[PDB]
Design an enzyme around this catalytic site. Structure first.
Site, mmCIF file in Angstrom:
data_model
loop_
_atom_site.group_PDB
_atom_site.id
_atom_site.type_symbol
_atom_site.label_atom_id
_atom_site.label_comp_id
_atom_site.label_asym_id
_atom_site.label_seq_id
_atom_site.Cartn_x
_atom_site.Cartn_y
_atom_site.Cartn_z
ATOM 1 N N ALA A 70 42.763 25.753 35.903
ATOM 2 C CA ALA A 70 44.265 25.841 35.102
ATOM 3 C C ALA A 70 44.854 27.023 35.308
ATOM 4 O O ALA A 70 45.600 27.747 34.731
ATOM 5 C CB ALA A 70 43.987 25.514 33.948
ATOM 6 N N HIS A 125 45.451 37.493 37.901
ATOM 7 C CA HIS A 125 45.814 37.933 36.570
ATOM 8 C C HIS A 125 44.370 37.749 35.649
ATOM 9 O O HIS A 125 44.012 36.707 35.508
ATOM 10 C CB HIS A 125 47.203 37.251 35.809
ATOM 11 C CG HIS A 125 46.988 35.792 35.844
ATOM 12 N ND1 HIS A 125 47.381 35.060 36.794
ATOM 13 C CD2 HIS A 125 47.053 34.851 34.792
ATOM 14 C CE1 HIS A 125 47.274 33.572 36.293
ATOM 15 N NE2 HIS A 125 47.103 33.606 35.102
ATOM 16 N N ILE A 126 44.048 38.677 34.787
ATOM 17 C CA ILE A 126 43.442 38.563 33.705
ATOM 18 C C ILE A 126 44.134 38.425 32.519
ATOM 19 O O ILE A 126 44.714 39.217 32.029
ATOM 20 C CB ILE A 126 42.385 39.920 33.612
ATOM 21 C CG1 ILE A 126 41.854 40.167 35.082
ATOM 22 C CG2 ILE A 126 41.195 39.751 32.711
ATOM 23 C CD1 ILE A 126 40.920 41.524 35.084
#
Ligand code: ADN
Ligand code: CL
Lengths: 101, 112
Positions: B91, B98-99
């Protein structure tokens, strides 16, 4: 649990299957240095932490997770951290939902 | 530009920025899934964690340390969760690494 459930080991880390899996593929990347929680990692751990993420993605490829997967690190009680040693969860083999818990 | 994060990086889209250095940017998620929900992203436009390489080892460790440093600053002392999504089954949706950092509520299990 058998020795082959260790998917990867080197001088820095261990990778092993989760015996309470939440997805068709579910494994765990841990450092050999016993960092208890990600909130207690320090600057000296920079290279190790990068290594753990690279090992996670390398192992995901080896496990056939070419259509996507999720990495999860839990800190503390609100994060549902279940063992006070740093673990990166890798989950795949199904559609992961959102929110992530 | 490959993603909307390019506008956040070049400041053409105003964002709630929590931290910035020459390697990364941290900003609040505009569809938050927790009382605190922010993103840690590299300035190097790695599209997905599966496309990171060995040369990125230092950067990746730096992103995790910035995530936990910012979690402390945001008052997440009772715990939090870091999430990295790869590809469609993960997803991911925005193809710039990105974290996610989520806190301020009890996180459930499984993690989606
Ligand atoms: N303009 C934006 N600013 C901040 N976060 C965003 C923006 N667009 C998408 N996101 C977040 O990035 C993640 C990937 O789509 C989601 O959590 C989503 O809410
Ligand atoms: Cl855990």
């Amino acid at each position: 649990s058998l020795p082959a459930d260790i998917l990867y080991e080197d001088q820095q880390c261990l990778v092993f299957r989760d015996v309470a899996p939440q997805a068709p593929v579910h494994f765990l990347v841990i450092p050999k240095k016993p960092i208890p929680r990600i909130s207690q990692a320090e600057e000296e751990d920079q290279q190790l932490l990068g290594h753990l993420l690279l090992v996670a993605k390398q192992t995901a490829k080896a496990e056939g997770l070419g259509d996507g997967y999720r990495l999860v690190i839990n800190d503390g009680k609100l994060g549902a951290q279940s063992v006070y040693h740093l673990h990166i969860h890798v989950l795949g083999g199904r559609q992961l939902q959102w929110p992530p818990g």
